[PDB]
DNA sequence: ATCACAATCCCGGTGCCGAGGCCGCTCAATTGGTCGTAGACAGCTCTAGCACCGCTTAAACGCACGTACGGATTCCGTACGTGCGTTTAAGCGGTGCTAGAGCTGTCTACGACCAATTGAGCGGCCTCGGCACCGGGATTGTGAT
DNA sequence: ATCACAATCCCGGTGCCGAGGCCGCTCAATTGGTCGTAGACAGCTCTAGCACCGCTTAAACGCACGTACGGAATCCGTACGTGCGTTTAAGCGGTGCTAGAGCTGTCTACGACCAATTGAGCGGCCTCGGCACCGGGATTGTGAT
């Protein structure tokens, strides 16, 4: 039985910010729980925003607004920059 | 505008809270606490307004902001 | 047809855009999901993970350790006002607490 | 005739705990709301009910805080609320 | 065809089963909704409303009033341990508070 | 513009429990907010239960479990009785 | 079984909480508080187990119960 | 040699605030969990990780409560925690 | 105690406005039929939960003793509450102007969906390096003297 | 202060086991095409938000005065912390047994969906009764005396 997780991606990001630093299985479990939790919070807020505005589609605008409502202070500022940069790069393939 | 929250008003709020005696430094402390609370709620309410591309903050925007900060309000459309 | 290019590589991300898209579509959030929504969400998740991991790796190095453990994650989150606020109602298993003694208790 | 300190205070508690009316003047509160919102977005309009919703929530929040502040004062064997009582209540509440 | 019989009347309820079904189907809760789910939900909503209204009407009669106002609803909810717990993080507009003075403050 | 509400049903129930008692518009607004809030809580918990158990359908079983998790003490006991009675009556038309 | 939560264990928990001096009546009070907390979480966890038609409470059941009581736990599958 | 009352207590604070290990014995805690669950459902089995998850949450909750209880004691000019401090902390927290 | 007295409460006696009911209509719920798949169910497989036992120290416990902390008492000055005269501005009503909320029609680009292809991501496995720990020496704060 | 000394810390020196990488494969993401509708946009309509002004008292304010409360100092007994010898049972390892978790195949009843019909529920309107309030008399607690 295969159980999907964000372990591979957390490790990829760790090797970018700290090339010589590893991670324990317990710490990896914390990171997996963290990603899943934040995903739920953002997606749930984006869902509410769409419903409040009588819209049937969750777009990058809903995600951006959810990020501003949930992430505190500069966390929101930098997260919005990252999301906007990614969408721009993706649209130019 | 924060001074519009007068000492008598703060005293009335304390009386409803069952407070019998009040120190003179409580009025400035209360004004600061109220400012923080209002800023938090208004920030989120304006975020909802901007997302709706509106120029008018609605009662619904306020209700949603209160709900997400765990202060659900009944009586204003939810 | 053309060689398969992942949406993650198109967005320059390490996090999986395709998986995030599926999780949004099957998570009962909305009827439809825009093409940019998974890209934006994946980038935000990646940014947050990078922030915590960078701060946790620093805590590991300060403890003369080469592997991050739950203690290092707890240290990174509780020592940052914004991360502490984001994870206020969160318990890190085997994370412990910040060393803090009230001054009135000191000899 | 002069009522002893505390008698009129307790009479005011009885009166305000029986009433449900708003205790902050409406016009000054509206000015504060508009002044605070200006820092987030300029030229902002407000539904009359939006300002009323804000006033109801703020008053409820402050009354609730004054209740916990009072408990802190009584805990320190005092009948007078002080800033340290407000600070403790908020800290324990997580604020 | 046969004369139209509402699902509410079939369940012996005053609350709208058909509307509750639509709200579940369009509320992004699940892909499918069982036939009994709206009936069960409508009955629960009806039971809770009846409980609050009965207690609020009693409070109105105790205040020599013939119409329920927010004050009566607040009195009914805060004077009942279970209703108070259910509506703990809820503010009733124009509801006021329960008359409560600490004994140490009394003359 | 028509805005649906539970006002008619709240009034019907009020006339059953208190035939000579009316209700103010403000109090009616509180009741409408209450019904909407409880609906969301129950439906949201039922949604989580279905997802946790890898099910695509919200049935009376999910609603019953949600009621037990949200309603405190005897509120849950009586609400479950009401829901079960309604489903039984409905299935026998 | 509540007595298995010994005075030394409660003292250790207090020490991590930064407590220097402890009254003798705290041990019984703490036992009562812990019992209430455990009952609340276990009740919900068992409800999830019964809904899954299982006879074994899983770590996920506990995680879900903690999450809905506003005590999210990281490290046990969510 | 005899350390003055308080010296070893502060040494224990330093040691336990630096460690992350569980402070309740595992076997007694498991017995309590099983005894409490018996009242909800009979013949209940438990995953080893389920008991561990419960232990981690309970210890975190009690440590957090002891932190707030300490603040209440200091507020009353005491260095000793008493049941009234636990009661106040829980009341303000909404428990 | 006894009496003034100041504030609240209780009760008729009226204005008035919103609860409450009705009416027309429409849009959303019901009836009926049709079809695809979610889930219940039966059977099987094997994971991991339970039971238990025998040691082996670490932890718990029970008690002895001393002292520092909690609480009761005392005193005293001033920061509060209460009251009153004076100023301020909230509230109300009225009037006027206009931004922008809300809605409708139109039309297109975007998202769902489906088939075909394919490569990332999963488990399974395997193995060296990080780390836990042991021991021993240095370091360092604590306390009697 | 000076010195014992008891506890912690820091650092080599080893076992060991889990982080970490690889491998095979498959299932889920990508490519490509196809089609229906969500939403952006333009235009229009009219609601309600804003601005303002002129009174009219209620509220706010500033101050005077007295006293009750907050806090500082004092004393004292005992409930705590610390230490030590003795008991208890947690932890660990090992072994065995089996409930029940997890999975797969099958098959059907149930839910989605669509067209046709229709009736509950919406706004709009309208109007009497509940209630807010005014005033006046009784009630009642508070405080000087």
mmCIF file of N, CA and C (backbone and C1' of nucleotides) in Angstrom, chain J residues 4 21 32 34 37 49 52-53 56 65 68-69 76 86 98 109 111 118 121 140-141 143:
data_model
loop_
_atom_site.group_PDB
_atom_site.id
_atom_site.type_symbol
_atom_site.label_atom_id
_atom_site.label_comp_id
_atom_site.label_asym_id
_atom_site.label_seq_id
_atom_site.Cartn_x
_atom_site.Cartn_y
_atom_site.Cartn_z
ATOM 1 P P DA J 4 40.401 22.915 50.763
ATOM 2 O "O5'" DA J 4 39.030 22.132 50.548
ATOM 3 C "C5'" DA J 4 38.436 21.389 51.629
ATOM 4 C "C4'" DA J 4 36.938 21.297 51.444
ATOM 5 C "C3'" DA J 4 36.464 20.100 50.618
ATOM 6 O "O3'" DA J 4 35.254 19.593 51.189
ATOM 7 C "C1'" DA J 4 35.651 22.074 49.656
ATOM 8 P P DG J 21 21.366 11.052 -0.300
ATOM 9 O "O5'" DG J 21 21.955 10.152 -1.474
ATOM 10 C "C5'" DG J 21 22.965 9.166 -1.190
ATOM 11 C "C4'" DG J 21 22.600 7.835 -1.804
ATOM 12 C "C3'" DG J 21 22.001 7.913 -3.213
ATOM 13 O "O3'" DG J 21 22.868 7.252 -4.141
ATOM 14 C "C1'" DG J 21 20.823 6.365 -1.839
ATOM 15 P P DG J 32 1.892 18.018 -27.237
ATOM 16 O "O5'" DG J 32 0.460 17.640 -27.823
ATOM 17 C "C5'" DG J 32 0.068 16.262 -27.965
ATOM 18 C "C4'" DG J 32 -1.408 16.163 -28.273
ATOM 19 C "C3'" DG J 32 -2.036 17.430 -28.864
ATOM 20 O "O3'" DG J 32 -2.693 17.086 -30.089
ATOM 21 C "C1'" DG J 32 -3.371 16.567 -27.121
ATOM 22 P P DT J 34 -10.118 17.631 -32.160
ATOM 23 O "O5'" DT J 34 -11.337 17.751 -31.141
ATOM 24 C "C5'" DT J 34 -11.623 16.685 -30.217
ATOM 25 C "C4'" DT J 34 -12.695 17.105 -29.238
ATOM 26 C "C3'" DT J 34 -13.639 18.205 -29.735
ATOM 27 O "O3'" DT J 34 -14.993 17.820 -29.470
ATOM 28 C "C1'" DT J 34 -12.755 18.788 -27.624
ATOM 29 P P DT J 37 -23.352 23.996 -20.346
ATOM 30 O "O5'" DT J 37 -22.822 24.864 -19.121
ATOM 31 C "C5'" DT J 37 -21.572 24.541 -18.484
ATOM 32 C "C4'" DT J 37 -20.788 25.794 -18.167
ATOM 33 C "C3'" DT J 37 -21.626 27.018 -17.788
ATOM 34 O "O3'" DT J 37 -20.931 27.739 -16.769
ATOM 35 C "C1'" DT J 37 -20.174 27.585 -19.514
ATOM 36 P P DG J 49 -25.333 52.254 3.492
ATOM 37 O "O5'" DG J 49 -23.894 52.925 3.368
ATOM 38 C "C5'" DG J 49 -23.216 52.967 2.100
ATOM 39 C "C4'" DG J 49 -22.623 54.336 1.861
ATOM 40 C "C3'" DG J 49 -22.183 55.080 3.126
ATOM 41 O "O3'" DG J 49 -20.838 55.540 2.964
ATOM 42 C "C1'" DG J 49 -23.532 56.478 1.781
ATOM 43 P P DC J 52 -18.910 68.859 4.375
ATOM 44 O "O5'" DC J 52 -20.175 69.720 4.816
ATOM 45 C "C5'" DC J 52 -21.295 69.881 3.926
ATOM 46 C "C4'" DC J 52 -22.513 70.345 4.691
ATOM 47 C "C3'" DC J 52 -22.213 71.033 6.028
ATOM 48 O "O3'" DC J 52 -23.013 72.211 6.142
ATOM 49 C "C1'" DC J 52 -23.820 69.359 6.331
ATOM 50 P P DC J 53 -22.497 73.462 6.996
ATOM 51 O "O5'" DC J 53 -23.802 74.368 7.109
ATOM 52 C "C5'" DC J 53 -25.044 73.928 6.529
ATOM 53 C "C4'" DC J 53 -26.137 73.910 7.573
ATOM 54 C "C3'" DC J 53 -25.780 74.585 8.901
ATOM 55 O "O3'" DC J 53 -26.903 75.352 9.345
ATOM 56 C "C1'" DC J 53 -26.570 72.418 9.306
ATOM 57 P P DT J 56 -33.978 74.810 20.188
ATOM 58 O "O5'" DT J 56 -34.331 73.378 20.793
ATOM 59 C "C5'" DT J 56 -33.801 72.169 20.216
ATOM 60 C "C4'" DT J 56 -33.483 71.166 21.301
ATOM 61 C "C3'" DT J 56 -33.449 71.747 22.715
ATOM 62 O "O3'" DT J 56 -34.000 70.808 23.641
ATOM 63 C "C1'" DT J 56 -31.342 70.808 22.203
ATOM 64 P P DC J 65 -11.983 72.188 48.801
ATOM 65 O "O5'" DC J 65 -12.402 70.804 49.464
ATOM 66 C "C5'" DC J 65 -13.762 70.336 49.385
ATOM 67 C "C4'" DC J 65 -13.850 68.884 49.789
ATOM 68 C "C3'" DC J 65 -12.858 68.444 50.871
ATOM 69 O "O3'" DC J 65 -13.548 67.660 51.847
ATOM 70 C "C1'" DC J 65 -12.755 66.974 49.044
ATOM 71 P P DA J 68 -14.270 55.069 54.520
ATOM 72 O "O5'" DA J 68 -14.167 53.842 53.509
ATOM 73 C "C5'" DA J 68 -14.330 54.037 52.093
ATOM 74 C "C4'" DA J 68 -13.164 53.453 51.326
ATOM 75 C "C3'" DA J 68 -12.701 52.068 51.778
ATOM 76 O "O3'" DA J 68 -12.216 51.371 50.631
ATOM 77 C "C1'" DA J 68 -10.915 53.579 51.982
ATOM 78 P P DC J 69 -12.376 49.786 50.511
ATOM 79 O "O5'" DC J 69 -11.334 49.424 49.363
ATOM 80 C "C5'" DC J 69 -11.017 50.393 48.350
ATOM 81 C "C4'" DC J 69 -9.521 50.552 48.208
ATOM 82 C "C3'" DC J 69 -8.710 49.259 48.332
ATOM 83 O "O3'" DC J 69 -7.802 49.183 47.230
ATOM 84 C "C1'" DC J 69 -7.779 50.941 49.689
ATOM 85 P P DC J 76 7.127 37.017 66.869
ATOM 86 O "O5'" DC J 76 6.100 35.804 66.769
ATOM 87 C "C5'" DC J 76 4.990 35.864 65.851
ATOM 88 C "C4'" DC J 76 4.819 34.545 65.132
ATOM 89 C "C3'" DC J 76 5.795 33.444 65.549
ATOM 90 O "O3'" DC J 76 5.114 32.185 65.538
ATOM 91 C "C1'" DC J 76 5.937 33.760 63.241
ATOM 92 P P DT J 86 18.506 0.654 54.713
ATOM 93 O "O5'" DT J 86 17.088 0.430 54.023
ATOM 94 C "C5'" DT J 86 15.901 1.000 54.605
ATOM 95 C "C4'" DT J 86 14.706 0.772 53.709
ATOM 96 C "C3'" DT J 86 14.641 -0.605 53.043
ATOM 97 O "O3'" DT J 86 13.338 -1.160 53.249
ATOM 98 C "C1'" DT J 86 14.373 1.100 51.424
ATOM 99 P P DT J 98 -4.237 -19.053 19.422
ATOM 100 O "O5'" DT J 98 -4.988 -17.718 18.985
ATOM 101 C "C5'" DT J 98 -5.212 -16.660 19.937
ATOM 102 C "C4'" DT J 98 -5.502 -15.358 19.227
ATOM 103 C "C3'" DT J 98 -6.418 -15.473 18.006
ATOM 104 O "O3'" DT J 98 -7.363 -14.402 18.019
ATOM 105 C "C1'" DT J 98 -4.456 -14.335 17.417
ATOM 106 P P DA J 109 -30.821 -4.428 -5.584
ATOM 107 O "O5'" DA J 109 -31.106 -3.412 -4.391
ATOM 108 C "C5'" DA J 109 -30.168 -3.263 -3.306
ATOM 109 C "C4'" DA J 109 -29.647 -1.847 -3.237
ATOM 110 C "C3'" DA J 109 -30.707 -0.748 -3.335
ATOM 111 O "O3'" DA J 109 -30.313 0.337 -2.490
ATOM 112 C "C1'" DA J 109 -29.127 -0.444 -5.040
ATOM 113 P P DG J 111 -28.525 7.364 -1.550
ATOM 114 O "O5'" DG J 111 -27.935 8.546 -2.440
ATOM 115 C "C5'" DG J 111 -26.527 8.617 -2.732
ATOM 116 C "C4'" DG J 111 -26.304 9.150 -4.129
ATOM 117 C "C3'" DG J 111 -27.012 10.473 -4.445
ATOM 118 O "O3'" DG J 111 -26.072 11.380 -5.035
ATOM 119 C "C1'" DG J 111 -27.440 8.897 -6.137
ATOM 120 P P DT J 118 -49.009 20.010 -13.114
ATOM 121 O "O5'" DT J 118 -48.708 20.552 -11.647
ATOM 122 C "C5'" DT J 118 -47.781 19.862 -10.787
ATOM 123 C "C4'" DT J 118 -47.264 20.789 -9.711
ATOM 124 C "C3'" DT J 118 -48.211 21.928 -9.321
ATOM 125 O "O3'" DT J 118 -48.198 22.084 -7.902
ATOM 126 C "C1'" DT J 118 -46.104 22.798 -9.836
ATOM 127 P P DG J 121 -41.413 26.504 2.061
ATOM 128 O "O5'" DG J 121 -40.684 27.853 1.631
ATOM 129 C "C5'" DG J 121 -39.929 27.917 0.408
ATOM 130 C "C4'" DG J 121 -39.835 29.340 -0.093
ATOM 131 C "C3'" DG J 121 -39.812 30.423 0.989
ATOM 132 O "O3'" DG J 121 -38.838 31.412 0.633
ATOM 133 C "C1'" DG J 121 -41.477 30.908 -0.580
ATOM 134 P P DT J 140 -40.856 47.271 49.130
ATOM 135 O "O5'" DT J 140 -39.280 47.447 48.993
ATOM 136 C "C5'" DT J 140 -38.716 48.147 47.867
ATOM 137 C "C4'" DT J 140 -37.390 48.765 48.247
ATOM 138 C "C3'" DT J 140 -36.849 48.331 49.612
ATOM 139 O "O3'" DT J 140 -35.458 48.021 49.506
ATOM 140 C "C1'" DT J 140 -36.825 50.663 49.453
ATOM 141 P P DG J 141 -34.790 46.950 50.492
ATOM 142 O "O5'" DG J 141 -33.236 47.262 50.356
ATOM 143 C "C5'" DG J 141 -32.647 47.534 49.071
ATOM 144 C "C4'" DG J 141 -31.820 48.797 49.122
ATOM 145 C "C3'" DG J 141 -30.705 48.806 50.173
ATOM 146 O "O3'" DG J 141 -29.512 49.329 49.580
ATOM 147 C "C1'" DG J 141 -32.056 50.720 50.426
ATOM 148 P P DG J 143 -24.208 53.999 51.917
ATOM 149 O "O5'" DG J 143 -24.443 55.222 52.908
ATOM 150 C "C5'" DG J 143 -24.855 56.493 52.383
ATOM 151 C "C4'" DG J 143 -25.311 57.408 53.494
ATOM 152 C "C3'" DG J 143 -24.368 57.498 54.697
ATOM 153 O "O3'" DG J 143 -24.244 58.873 55.067
ATOM 154 C "C1'" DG J 143 -26.549 57.056 55.424
#
